[PDB]
Amino acid sequence: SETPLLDELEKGPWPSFVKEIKKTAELMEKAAAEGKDVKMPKGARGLLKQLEISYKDKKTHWKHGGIVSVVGYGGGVIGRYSDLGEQIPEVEHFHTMRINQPSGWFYSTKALRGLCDVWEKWGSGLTNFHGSTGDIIFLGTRSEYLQPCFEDLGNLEIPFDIGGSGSDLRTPSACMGPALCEFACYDTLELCYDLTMTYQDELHRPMWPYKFKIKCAGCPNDCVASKARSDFAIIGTWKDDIKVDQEAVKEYASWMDIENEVVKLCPTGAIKWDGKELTIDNRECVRCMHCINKMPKALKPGDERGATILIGGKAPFVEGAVIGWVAVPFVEVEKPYDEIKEILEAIWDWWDEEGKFRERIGELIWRKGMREFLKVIGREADVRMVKAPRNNPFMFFEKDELKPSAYTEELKKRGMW
């Protein structure tokens, strides 16, 4: 009875992660006994054994690990050291490799199999599909195998590069967008790839004060959770009228309580149904999507499409958890996305110059203010950036906004200007 605590977790209908680890050890060791080119066959069983001790102790058995990477890069590999390194030698080193996913996590079977072959050769055989940022996670290899593994990945027929970690541009991710979704207001997947490609250096070679994440949602439903999990959330939107098929609205009206499930749930009362015609006051509409989510055969986003950029989203450390807020109410999204890239690169230049060690962009904006942030990106303040104007009178004014006066001359005279 090797793993009695973990064994209980193979019972039950939800697919078991313990069954995932047990299969990996059992087949990896089978491969290495069969003479397959496998460098860490004892990888998964060692992990299983450690996790069992962890369960007993009710604590982790991993410690702070060395800085370990592939040649040419500074990010993408997370070093992990076991403190049971002598009792369980096979997990003494157990590093992760973050492998950049294709946009929208779309795969061909060939692409996936290449990944499997390489990782079977060099690692534990354990993966995550996917790590939260979006990357494929290769879970557990030794320091020696990092560079040869990466060589093999980049030598594949369909090759995969390393994603981001550390104080770099993290791997961008995107909702499925136009590939499957009729709500998509721009090509999320192309945007995501183009960004990933354009900023390869910034992703591979951390040079920034801290991490930076970009996520791309095709409409306000935000299916990659960009506003909470990215510093720079590109969320699709439109500027014109919601397209209304009155015929299709009647089809819904024949079975759906439109009054209660649509009209009364509109946050702004923009949408009216009298039993004959659906009317949307698009001036009142805040494009929350509810009515479109409700009657997708009848209601479509407008034809003037782009995105709203929300800035600052992050987990709590250090200054509190952030759902991103309105930075650019509307930007066009068209290849080569020069307008978006212009914004990003200005943000990075500024952040790199002004950011403190481990200061996220959201915290930088809180520290420096929206005026400085908007000047950096060359945009003007907009009422849409706030839920409400400030509740206190303590406003900063630019020197040049002041009326020339004996007082201002005194400030200038003293070099306090």
């Binding site: 039950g12 061909s108 839920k387």
Partner: protein, 363 residues
């Protein structure tokens, strides 16, 4: 010649199913046929079905190989993962949908579901976004996989059917680094410590950069010790966040008996009907009780069931609270309000509450 670098991920468009590739950005309407299966109709009149399956996120490469075998048979050698770590197949023959479901369950043991239908207003419970825990991370207070396993065994029937009147995201973080969307989920499980760090003077001298460690404490509980070349901790100011351990291996705060999880509630990401919301603590602490965490699991279920029994169609947890108030929420969920739930995290600016953390505004 050496080694190729800076080449990026493979181009997604090359890894697309022909029907998807052909009808790219030219879709008419989707239709949720039944739990786990979504019909997608192109303007060209082409029809495809996207079939969704729960995964344990952590996969054996041999499970991925099996998924690839499945994908070759039913989905033209194509599949995707979702932003909640479910996996989706693309079926063009409606008669073959049910077969695929059976073979996924027989081969890899993955359930069909994790979908919802806003049109009818019936919702499934989808996968739980989660992190590394005792599997790979050095800063966790709880396991991830173990708890996710325990919770989803208990809540299984909500994944495979449309039993809920609105969307409910469950999510988990193994520590306050709160990796994932845990801080904006309808129900969130967050690993917390309840004990301050006991400084290891030797390890701090050898391995830690003192000023950056001190600067990482949100409460300023940390100060450099000069005549000992180390860090001093003021226990009265410490709320056991563990950030100092992230910075410095000489600052552990793990107590197996007092580490555990807080349960938070009422986050929301979407814009539909009402603005996004950050989750709120409603249960301060539950113990680690591996391998089944029965205390943790009981409360999550207790919270979910109370919400489901009372919520109107589309009325997500935060929206339900908007209607009834927190007084009635605590009564109905049978939970205790204690001083712990009164927010005291001082550093966060009030002005953030005035920023528009939402895409909802008028033109």
């Amino acid at each position: 010649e050496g080694v190729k670098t800076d080449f990026g991920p493979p181009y997604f468009r090359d890894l697309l199913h022909p029907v998807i590739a052909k009808n790219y950005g030219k879709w008419k309407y989707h239709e949720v046929v039944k739990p786990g299966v979504i019909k997608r109709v192109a303007e060209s009149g082409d029809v495809i079905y996207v079939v969704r399956f729960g995964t344990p996120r952590l996969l054996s490469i041999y499970t991925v190989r099996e998924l690839c075998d499945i994908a070759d048979k039913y989905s033209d050698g194509y599949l995707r993962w979702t932003s909640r770590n479910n996996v989706e197949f693309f079926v063009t023959d409606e008669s073959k949908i049910d077969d695929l479901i059976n073979e996924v369950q027989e081969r890899v043991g993955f359930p069909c579901g994790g979908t919802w239908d806003a049109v009818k207003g019936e919702y499934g419970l989808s996968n739980i976004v989660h992190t590394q825990g005792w599997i790979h991370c050095h800063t966790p207070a709880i396991d991830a996989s173990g708890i996710v396993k325990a919770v989803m065994d208990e809540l299984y029937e909500y994944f495979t059917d449309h039993k809920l009147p609105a969307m409910c995201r469950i999510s988990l973080a193994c520590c306050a680094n709160m990796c994932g969307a845990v801080h904006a989920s309808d129900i969130a499980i967050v690993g917390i410590h309840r004990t301050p760090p006991i400084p290891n003077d030797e390890a701090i001298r050898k391995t830690c950069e003192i000023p950056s460690t001190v600067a990482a404490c949100p409460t300023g509980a940390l100060k450099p010790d000069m005549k000992n070349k180390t860090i001093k901790v003021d226990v009265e100011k410490c709320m056991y966040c563990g950030n100092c351990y992230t910075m410095c291996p000489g600052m552990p705060l793990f107590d197996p008996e007092n580490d555990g999880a807080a349960i938070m509630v009422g986050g929301k990401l979407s814009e539909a009907r009402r603005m996004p919301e950050l989750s709120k603590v409603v249960v301060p602490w539950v113990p680690n009780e591996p391998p089944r965490w029965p205390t943790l699991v009981k409360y999550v279920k207790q919270i979910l069931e109370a919400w489901a029994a009372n919520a109107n169609k589309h009325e997500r947890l935060i929206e339900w609270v908007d209607r009834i108030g927190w007084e009635r929420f605590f009564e109905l969920t049978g939970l205790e309000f204690t001083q712990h739930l009164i927010d005291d995290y001082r550093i966060t600016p009030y002005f953030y509450s005035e920023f528009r953390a939402s895409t909802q505004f008028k033109w």
